[PDB]
Amino acid sequence: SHMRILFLSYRFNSLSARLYCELTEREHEVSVELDVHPDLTVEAAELYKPDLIIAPFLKRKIPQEVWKKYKTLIIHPGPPGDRGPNALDWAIMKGERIWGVTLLEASEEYDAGDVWAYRTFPMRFARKASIYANEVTEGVVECVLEALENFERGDFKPTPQKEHWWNPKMEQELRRVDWEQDDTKTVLRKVYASDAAPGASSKVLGKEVLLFNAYPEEELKGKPGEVLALRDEAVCIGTRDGAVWITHMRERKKESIKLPSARVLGEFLKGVKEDPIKPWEKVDFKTYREILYEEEDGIGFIHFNFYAGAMSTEQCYRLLETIKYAKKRPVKAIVLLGSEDFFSNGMNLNTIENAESPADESWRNINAIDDVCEEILKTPDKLTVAGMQGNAGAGGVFLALTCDLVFAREGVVLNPHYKNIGNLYGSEFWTYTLPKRVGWEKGKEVMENRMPISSKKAFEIGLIDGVFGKTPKEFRQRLKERIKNFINSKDFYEFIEKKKKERTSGEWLEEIQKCREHELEKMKLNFYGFDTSYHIARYYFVRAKPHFRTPPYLAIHRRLKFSL
């Protein structure tokens, strides 16, 4: 059973990429056609002639002549019988305690098809994007693998829907945050239901904005809608009964992009006081903590919750400060944990796109990331560990590889390449870390591959040191257990005595410095050379510019020497 499967996807988003990994790593073939026009979707089915069509992420209705000719399965982010385009938004706005995902056949009426598989799960009070990236994606993977088994046996009959309900597209009026009428929990619900799209509309300091990435505040209080403090470019705003932090906003203009709240609001904030909290401080009330540092059992853990996994120049320097602090503590190991949803995705393209000179900000950002990487590498007397709870890509993958040990949760998706951002050369000392892990030949193959790999595949090829745990929490618990065991063994003290010798030698230090210099000269060419392929790719990505065809690297049915 080696099937030829066609994905229909609005964008090749995280769910599409997770399912791509699960299917191709089982030796099925997956071709992708992006959702551009029904005529293109029809042409792609006729060109590729799939065994099976899966639609992980649909915008347009599938043309009748496709799904009447090829078995076509649709992913719906709600339990059986739920119908409509904003299933998750409604489930969060309504406060459902149980939700689910359904794999169902295409049909004439919207979301009416017979059910092939479904999974249910308890709801978290959390951002829509986090539900989609964790509970929904894990459930969808189980549905799809189950349906491939059913499909190959050949006598499967799906289950028609009995009871069902329809929720229309959710309107902004329902999402809009009113600082006077809404208590903190209501603000949270509205932002969570709208994050990472379309955002919850609001007014702040006179500006019509969309709100993203909210956190409750318990100490600071004031008048509803008053800005009470600034902290790492997040703003804290009074609610009816309290206060809420908003880390990111987007103005409601055509050209505008999602940015840290301080950069959107700008001069309007003049006079607000920064309310700093160091990551290593203990607080016993709820508040916004971008970076958290905690010690347990001789291990120092650094959580860094950078929105979208994107690390701006300033977030890099804040992370560096915390690594430096940790390296002065009496810990045996330092563990970089990122956030539950992302380890890191590299440079912050939005803050780069927003800068007066994108090229100068790119140069600032890559040097900031490399300063973090350098500090990690030059840690002679402690174990360094990257714990990837969530996806990673571009410079974020190579940040992890500077750690002595790299572990990832099961189901993490990796993009260890730059082919989506204008073929950047990359830095982060990859010319040192990558061949030490896979060899030069395979390392070059890894960075030429534009398609994603799973953390299981990354472990099998030697790119990372282990993969375990189904959820972020389970992964953190097994990670701590495994590190705790190592640092309490004789093997750890032998290892540190060797590392102390290697990482203080002049030879090793000149080696890593030469790798940084050579990488940065290439990135300098990328950022400033006459070829501006990097800037062009960044513009299309940050601005979400639409596609007018499916590139051949996605569409196998549209490659030059394609036949049969």
Residue numbers in the entry: -1 to 562
What does the paper say about this structure?
The crystallographic analyses reveal that HypX consists of the N- and C-terminal domains that are structurally homologous to the hydrolase domain of FDH and enoyl-CoA hydratase/isomerase (ECH/ECI), respectively. HypX will catalyze two consecutive reactions, the formyl-group transfer from N10-formyl-THF to CoA and decarbonylation of formyl-CoA, in the N- and C-terminal domains, respectively, to produce CO. The putative catalytic residues, His74, Asp80, and Asp109 in the N-terminal domain and Ty416 and Glu426 in the C-terminal domain, are perfectly conserved among HypX homologs listed in the previous report. CoA is constitutively bound in HypX, which will act as the prosthetic group for CO biosynthesis through the formation and the decarbonylation of formyl-CoA. CO produced by HypX is used as a ligand of the iron in the NiFe(CN)2(CO) center of NiFe hydrogenases.
We prepared and determined the crystal structures of variants in which mutations were introduced at amino acid residues interacting with CoA to elucidate physiological roles of these residues. Further mutations on Ser194, Gln195, and Asn306, which interact with 3’-phosphate group of CoA, resulted in a decrease of CoA binding affinity. The Q15A-R131A-S194A-Q195A-N306A-R542A variant showed two MS peaks due to apo (CoA-free) and holo (CoA-bound) form in native MS analysis while only holo form was observed in wild-type. Thus, a loss of hydrogen bonds with 3’-phosphate group of CoA decreases CoA binding affinity of HypX and these hydrogen bonds play an important role for tethering CoA in the cavity.
